[PDB]
Amino acid sequence: APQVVDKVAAVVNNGVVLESDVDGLMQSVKLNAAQARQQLPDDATLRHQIMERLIMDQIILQMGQKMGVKISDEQLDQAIANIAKQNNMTLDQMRSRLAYDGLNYNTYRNQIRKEMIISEVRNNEVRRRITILPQEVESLAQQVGNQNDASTELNLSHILIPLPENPTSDQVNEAESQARAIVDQARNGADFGKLAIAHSADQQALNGGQMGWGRIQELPGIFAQALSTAKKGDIVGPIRSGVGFHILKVNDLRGESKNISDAAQKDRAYRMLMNRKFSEEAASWMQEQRASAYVKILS
Amino acid sequence: LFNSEEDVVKMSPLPTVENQFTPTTAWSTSVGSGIGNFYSNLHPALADNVVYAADRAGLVKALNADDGKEIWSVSLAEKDGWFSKEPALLSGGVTVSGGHVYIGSEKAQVYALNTSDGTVAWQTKVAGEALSRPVVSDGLVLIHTSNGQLQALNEADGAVKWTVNLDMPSLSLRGESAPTTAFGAAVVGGDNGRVSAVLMEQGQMIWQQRISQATGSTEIDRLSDVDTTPVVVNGVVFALAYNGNLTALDLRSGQIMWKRELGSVNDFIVDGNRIYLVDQNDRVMALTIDGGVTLWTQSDLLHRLLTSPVLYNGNLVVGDSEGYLHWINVEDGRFVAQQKVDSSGFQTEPVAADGKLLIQAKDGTVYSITR
Amino acid sequence: CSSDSRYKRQVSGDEAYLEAAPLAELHAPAGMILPVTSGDYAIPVTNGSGAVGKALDIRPPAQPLALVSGARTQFTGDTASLLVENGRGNTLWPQVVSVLQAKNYTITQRDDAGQTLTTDWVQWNRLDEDEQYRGRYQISVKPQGYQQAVTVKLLNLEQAGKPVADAASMQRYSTEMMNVISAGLDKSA
Amino acid sequence: ERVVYRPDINQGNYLTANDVSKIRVGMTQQQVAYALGTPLMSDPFGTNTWFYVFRQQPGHEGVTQQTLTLTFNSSGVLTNIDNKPALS
Amino acid sequence: GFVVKDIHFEGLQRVAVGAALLSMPVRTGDTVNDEDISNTIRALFATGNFEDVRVLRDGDTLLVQVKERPTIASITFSGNKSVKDDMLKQNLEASGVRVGESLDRTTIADIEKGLEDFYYSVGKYSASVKAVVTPLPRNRVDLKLVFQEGVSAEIQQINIVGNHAFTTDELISHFQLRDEVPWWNVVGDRKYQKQKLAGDLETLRSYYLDRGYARFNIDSTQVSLTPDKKGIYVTVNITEGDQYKLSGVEVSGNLAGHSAEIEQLTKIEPGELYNGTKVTKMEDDIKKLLGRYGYAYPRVQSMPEINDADKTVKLRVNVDAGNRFYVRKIRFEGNDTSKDAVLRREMRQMEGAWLGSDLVDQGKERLNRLGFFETVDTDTQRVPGSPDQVDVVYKVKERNTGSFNFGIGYGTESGVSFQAGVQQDNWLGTGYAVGINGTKNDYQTYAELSVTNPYFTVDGVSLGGRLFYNDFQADDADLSDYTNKSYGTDVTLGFPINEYNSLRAGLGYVHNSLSNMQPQVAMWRYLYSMGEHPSTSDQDNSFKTDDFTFNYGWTYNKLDRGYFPTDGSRVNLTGKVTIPGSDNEYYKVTLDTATYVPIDDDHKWVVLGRTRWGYGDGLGGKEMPFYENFYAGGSSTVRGFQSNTIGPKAVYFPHQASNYDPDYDYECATQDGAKDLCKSDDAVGGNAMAVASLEFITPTPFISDKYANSVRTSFFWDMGTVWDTNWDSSQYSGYPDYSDPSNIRMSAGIALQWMSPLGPLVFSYAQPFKKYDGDKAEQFQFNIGKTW
Amino acid sequence: EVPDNPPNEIYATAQQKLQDGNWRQAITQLEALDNRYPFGPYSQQVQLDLIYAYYKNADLPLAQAAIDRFIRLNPTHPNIDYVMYMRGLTNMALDDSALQGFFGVDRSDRDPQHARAAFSDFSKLVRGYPNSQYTTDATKRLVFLKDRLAKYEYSVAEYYTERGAWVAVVNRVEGMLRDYPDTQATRDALPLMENAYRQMQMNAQAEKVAKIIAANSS
């Protein structure tokens, strides 16, 4: 019988997703899950999120092509430092990629080009969207006083239940019910990582929604007021910020009384303000692009 | 030729509601022919328990707030008969301050009638049709003419203190934005979609910032008119454009804080940590002030041309084009009550002050609503 | 209302222009010249011979249809060639043969080794002609680059028992045979 | 005897005493054309001759004609002028 | 890593396999990986010709499955009522969507929006558009665009700010855009059009400059929509300035010796108000005056020097005539039927002669007056590379100058019968006027031929001839009934005397022979005047007369056109006088008049005054023969009356008929039942006639301009009277006085004329609200051919 | 009128109706093919058949439009000589009339626009493609059209001789000598030119024209 080699899985603005991309990220996420010990759900729920990530990636790649952004070979050389984890394992060749694709070179190099181009255009657009006000910087700096108040550092897992920019009340209550159900499951004992892989519109869904270690002030504010009162492992109910309902889990926390001795505090405060602004504008702009873009999943 | 060939059916039906109270009409008084079918800004004005109302030709009338009894009436339509009896084409709405009653006119005239009996203290010619509602502040009377010119008439004698030019697009929506007092400044809209701030002393522009997306193809898709009144609260300016974004801006720097695809030409309300809004589609909504998140929405009145909302007795009130007044709970979109007031539609904004709600129908009848 | 069988393949005119007087030059007398001609209405002297008036067939030149997927189809003097694509391979020759077997034509020569064949005579039942033509044809398939290509050629055309070698007739009834071949191949597919 | 309306048949190009007095021998063809205008009549049978004819037939009143013949050389330089103010 | 033995394509419909293969990164070679297949799929989609692309492997064979973007089979605009299909179709074509083109589904929304945009350009802002895609069998699609047109936006106000000399109502009364539509103006509307606002602003500027305002300026104009976008507001901010007076006009430049006339054109009353349109008309008059002398391309520019302190304006007019242009060739285009000389002989501008343009316009109006062409236009084209020469090209569209009349009467009841006639004014494009008429019955035979050469001599002398034959004798002469057999010939020669007047002179011969006439007062009076003494009690009698006549005439013609004129007047006088030697002597004269006065600048509304007069009488003791009498009534003279019914009626003496049928179908004076003189309804006509008519011609309401030249509608009021001047009123006192002209018949109604393929057709409905006893009424009448 | 069968069957029906000799239904079928399938195995063949059927049906404006579009879309087509020949034929066809021809009317006095266009097209065909199959008939038609144009000029010159516009007569005959020197109309016009010269008392030029007439009328 004839064997299907490749096919179009999704149609986007003048682009197509091939089945050799869904499978690649499927194997990537399965391998990461196996190394991370975190069990992952059934073929279809994992497939929907991978397809969504690929639609968003294709949209961003076509925007980069339209806008005349290209990547240098030295950028690939630098990405070899972290993308291939050469610093952790001392070997240059593609024999480290033992899992799948037969240790091929071109495939992983193109994958890295895909990530660098997405990151570059994402950064450029989000940076061009940021507005900084001197008053806010002064306020945040004066907040950064009294022995570096709120020096709490957090590693958190996040889940986003999306809503369109102009949603209907029907959609509002649907999203509300979904978010409350996820929150109830998380609070009742369900593993948040498994919930995050199954139920999430964020880019980090495929990674389980982990945001990594950060500082509370870096939060867009929508999370910090609720988050100041929470212990390790707690589940925070649904919130809003324009892009949909938000759910947060406190994976880990670590605090210390270190104080940096303003001359050097203003620059740091500007850094954290830029971090929060980038995180919020990135989420808003990625949601806007998803709503605007043309797409027709294929089956 | 044929009167049975053109019609579009896009009007919502009258919702059914269980009124928690019984709306009542304390009194009603006829004021001339009224606004009529023309789109105008004319509406009553409440000052020291006196109700001042006007007419498109001009019938300035003062009525008691308690029982709508009048204390003095005058007509500004060719008092001396310079040419027959031409209409004054009043469309500025009644403004009341310092014993003076300021009214605009589409003949490019601004009248400053007296409070004691209506004697025209002064009348000043302006750059064009005074469509905007006069704004009295710092001894000045600010007008925004239809040809895109902000003028600041002197309160005492009506002399033009200064003037500022604003860009005018090839097409716009009828009406003009009324400036705001702010702090020694004037925050105004514009038909080009750019909100501007001008110092009160002279016309030195302080800042200007675009508010409309205006990503259209033809003129009708670039209607970026800011015909609302910018609202200043704690140093942030709230503005709202037609087919544009509801945005918040720094009062002095002018940089936007946040934006939301929501458009309207009706004045909104900023109360506490909430923003009550009526969109261009007649969709009553409630948002928060720190960020745009639509706290709740109501669509039962969609495409029923509504007036701007007013906060009264702790609930929101809106009129409609069929003469029905609707009460809405602030906490949620549920209707609190509904009433029939007039057969002619309600177009111009209601007035809610001193524990009293007043409205004016298209036919010119001033109504007082109580309980 | 009234009509004749020959209203087709005829000039929509009176054919009176054939009686126009021939053009003759003017002699320039001695001591002067005739005005210089503009050359805008000059008629070049072409020595070609061809049909004129009613004897000229104005029916559009029959171009090969190229129904089966192909391109760069052509019609030569007495032969016609069609180029095919889509991975036909050696299997092209069987199909061609089968197609010409479906027409029950009198195939006289069948050289499968050379991918060639030749028939005796086929007739055409055309409503357009006052007299029906008939022709003898030879068909073949030969390799070209990646794939095979079919060619159909006419040995001669005959009317009322006498031969004819008009270019238009040859072209028409070679495009006829080529269309037959292409339609048969498309039907087989 | 011929008592029927006949329109004026103007023929040639308008000539005035000043224009005819502006041209002189030695003038090039461009200068002559500038002074008098483009001639409505030339010699097509192998000579560089320009005919300025001025016909006027107002009706049954009788025709009048002034003919000015300008003969140029091969180089285009006016060589001879022949002015006839009336018919013979 | 595998060798591709073969590549097979599936699903290709429009894209040739060759093009796809060229669009492929693969070359049927080998050394192929999975990534190569992925890149091939991506490249195929990048071509933009495919909606779905798939690659399959069957052993060593490459199966390429492609779903081509379906093809548009048909586009159906359903629901559109104001925007017409052709227009909208052209707009959608311009957008890139057409039948056969592959439907890129990623743009349907776009085209929908584009259509809405077009509606916005039409004045319909609240219009909705939706695209429905219906799948067909051969992977084609029908793209039906369903239209929900919104309620049109109307103007709620037009406001002018800064006007103090004139009220707003008066200023906007002249605008095309209107705020209010009067209740009686059902055809008006409040629709807004950008081109009209532009013209209204120009109208306002002209109004203010024409009433004296050299400094008038329009500061700005604003157009606004109501939030719901069903109302429109227009504002115009203006600055009147102040009123100015003219100080003087001084002309300078190269006037080419025409200073006296140009200065006479630029005359002003000292101290008059400034006027822009007067200045424009002075410019145009100077240009026209220069053009009369061959200066076809002058430059005339006027600049006003303004004096604000004195508030007076002095015009400085600079004139440069330029070169005097000559005509090189006159060319005629569109005369596919008319002979070239037919058009060229109407020219007043000679070919090889200096230009005047007045002559070119004269030739154009001559061609229009000819009537052979529906449209005539002129174009003066400069000869390339020539500073002094032009070519005049007349472009004409030919008409149907002929007209046909046909009918059948009794049919086969008695023998055979028919009626036919043809009239051509440009027979075979030769300019000849030809005409044949005939009728056949068992009771009558008639034949008539007429041929006229309008240019028998180059100057315009025309030569015409006419033959006619008429008979009333029955076949085989069954019984001696009334008979009237006549024939004759007529030769006429005409010649012009002005550009608009011509005279005609000719000779005619007519033979008449009547017999078995019914005795009646008028005919017997005439016969007695002739010297005959026929009996009165019996119907047996005979009478024969040969007549030679001299015919004369004069025609003045200055009509706008030869068909459906909109201006000018035409007068035609005809007459005849018997040459001494005829069997009877008399004179006759007729006079037709038709005047057109336009009321609209476009000449759409016209007033037509038509008239006809006629008088005849004997010379010696004779009288005008009763067969030359005048008749009135019918579609030609007085609509609403039966043909030839107005006028005196026959009075019969008692007598015995030559036949006696049992049907009692005999005149009142039959001897069987009558013994005294009795009247009848049989019209006999009179020797004096006067008819008039006033018509108001209006545009046809339900036809586009493509047929405007083909149909004419009018409302008419007609008057007419006929009387016999010799009626002896002293006798016959018991019968109407037929000599009285005061008995004027009148009618009023509506008429429609259509230039059908069979010539002119005239329909009319007329009520004859004034008539006298014996007149036969005919409200609805139909006619073929040139009426009057 | 036109069903929705595949292009193959529509083309088969169109060919059958062309062979039968009915142009209207065949025109409908080919127009359906052209509008519905503007590309494929049948393209251009449909346009050639449309040109032929429009010509045979006396739909000359449509034939001109089809010929123009075909020429501007497929200039390199091998059978473009046939298209140019059909352009010449349809322009000559627009230059004829039925009733006047029936009555034996000499139409050379009427508008020569269509004859001029036909001459231009036939000259283009003959010069561009000397070996074409239609070149002999095109040459014969060119000789006829040249004679017609010279006769039109002669008619104009004769009229102006009648009117008495001698400059116009001289210019017209000179244009004939410069444009159509070898036509019979030019030989007939020369006496008109000589008479026009003499009436203006330009005896030297009348002498030259008389010399030409004597040297060639023999």
Swiss-Prot record, chain A:
Residues 151-252 form the PpiC domain. Its main location: periplasm. Its EC number is 5.2.1.8. The keyword Signal applies. One of its GO terms (cellular component) is outer membrane-bounded periplasmic space. It is found in: Periplasm. Pfam families: Rotamase (PF00639), Rotamase_3 (PF13616), SurA_N (PF09312). The keyword Signal applies. GO terms for biological process: chaperone-mediated protein folding; Gram-negative-bacterium-type cell outer membrane assembly; maintenance of stationary phase; maintenance of unfolded protein; protein folding; protein stabilization. It catalyses: [protein]-peptidylproline (omega=180) = [protein]-peptidylproline (omega=0). Keywords: Chaperone, Isomerase, Periplasm, Repeat, Rotamase, Signal. One of its GO terms (molecular function) is peptide binding. Chaperone involved in the correct folding and assembly of outer membrane proteins, such as OmpA, OmpF and LamB. Recognizes specific patterns of aromatic residues and the orientation of their side chains, which are found more frequently in integral outer membrane proteins. May act in both early periplasmic and late outer membrane-associated steps of protein maturation. Essential for the survival of E.coli in stationary phase. Required for pilus biogenesis. This is Chaperone SurA. It comes from Escherichia coli (strain K12). The gene is surA.
From Swiss-Prot, chain B:
Keywords: Cell outer membrane, Lipoprotein, Membrane, Palmitate, Signal. GO terms for molecular function: identical protein binding. InterPro entries: BamB, PQQ_b-propeller_rpt, PQQ_rpt_dom, Quinoprotein_ADH-like_sf, WD40/YVTN_repeat-like_dom_sf. It is found in: Cell outer membrane. One of its GO terms (cellular component) is membrane. It is a lipid-anchor. One of its GO terms (biological process) is protein insertion into membrane. The keyword Lipoprotein applies. CDD domains: PQQ_DH_like. Transmembrane segments: none annotated. Part of the outer membrane protein assembly complex (Bam), which is involved in assembly and insertion of beta-barrel proteins into the outer membrane. Nonessential member of the complex, which may orient the flexible periplasmic domain of BamA for interaction with other Bam components, chaperones and nascent outer membrane proteins. Efficient substrate folding and insertion into the outer membrane requires all 5 subunits. Part of the Bam complex, which is composed of the outer membrane protein BamA, and four lipoproteins BamB, BamC, BamD and BamE. Monomer. Interacts directly with BamA. The Bam complex has the shape of a hat, with the BamA beta-barrel crown in the outer membrane and the periplasmic brim formed by the BamA POTRA domains and the 4 lipoproteins. PANTHER family: CELL SURFACE PROTEIN, OUTER MEMBRANE PROTEIN ASSEMBLY FACTOR BAMB. Belongs to the BamB family. This is Outer membrane protein assembly factor BamB. It comes from Escherichia coli (strain K12). The gene is bamB.
From Swiss-Prot, chain C:
A lipid is attached at C1 (S-diacylglycerol cysteine). It comes from the Bacteria. The keyword Lipid biosynthesis does not apply. The keyword Coiled coil does not apply. It is a lipid-anchor. Its main location: membrane. GO terms for cellular component: Bam protein complex; cell surface; membrane. One of its GO terms (biological process) is protein insertion into membrane. A lipid is attached at C1 (N-palmitoyl cysteine). Keywords: Cell outer membrane, Lipoprotein, Membrane, Palmitate, Signal. It is found in: Cell outer membrane. One of its GO terms (molecular function) is identical protein binding. Belongs to the BamC family. Part of the outer membrane protein assembly complex (Bam), which is involved in assembly and insertion of beta-barrel proteins into the outer membrane. Nonessential member of the complex that stabilizes the interaction between the essential proteins BamA and BamD. Efficient substrate folding and insertion into the outer membrane requires all 5 subunits. Contains two well-defined domains connected by a flexible linker. The C-terminal domain may serve as an important protein-binding surface for interaction with other Bam components or substrates. In addition, contains a long unstructured N-terminal region, which is required to stabilize the BamCD complex. Only the N-terminus of this protein is observed in the Bam complex in X-ray or EM structures, most of the protein must be highly mobile. This is Outer membrane protein assembly factor BamC.
From Swiss-Prot, chain E:
The keyword Transmembrane applies. Changing E413C: No effect. Lethal. One of its GO terms (biological process) is cell adhesion. InterPro entries: Bac_surfAg_D15, BamA/TamA_POTRA, D15-like, OM_assembly_BamA, POTRA. It is found in: Cell outer membrane. PROSITE patterns: POTRA. It comes from the Bacteria. Residues 2-69, 70-150, 153-241, 244-322, 325-399 form the POTRA domain. Disruption phenotype: Deletion is lethal. Depletion results in the accumulation of incorrectly assembled outer membrane proteins, including TolC, OmpF, OmpC and OmpA. Decreased expression leads to decreased susceptibility to contact-dependent growth inhibition (CDI), and decreased expression of outer membrane proteins (including in this study LamB) as well as up-regulation of periplasmic protease DegP. Residues 1-402, 425-432, 454-461, 485-500, 556-568, 598-606, 697-710, 756 are periplasmic. The chain crosses the membrane at residues 403-411, 414-424, 433-440, 444-453, 462-473, 483-484, 501-513, 542-555, 569-578, 587-597, 607-617, 687-696, 711-723, 746-755, 757-767, 782-786. Changing E413L: Very minor growth defect. Lethal. GO terms for cellular component: Bam protein complex; cell outer membrane; membrane. Pfam families: Omp85 (PF01103), POTRA (PF07244). Changing D478L: Very minor growth defect. Changing G407P: Lethal, wild-type protein levels. Changing K786C: Reduced folding of OmpT. Gene3D superfamilies: membrane protein fhac, membrane protein fhac: a member of the omp85/tpsb transporter family. Residues 412-413, 441-443, 474-482, 514-541, 579-586, 618-686, 724-745, 768-781 are extracellular. HAMAP family: OM_assembly_BamA. Belongs to the BamA family. This is Outer membrane protein assembly factor BamA. It comes from Escherichia coli (strain K12).
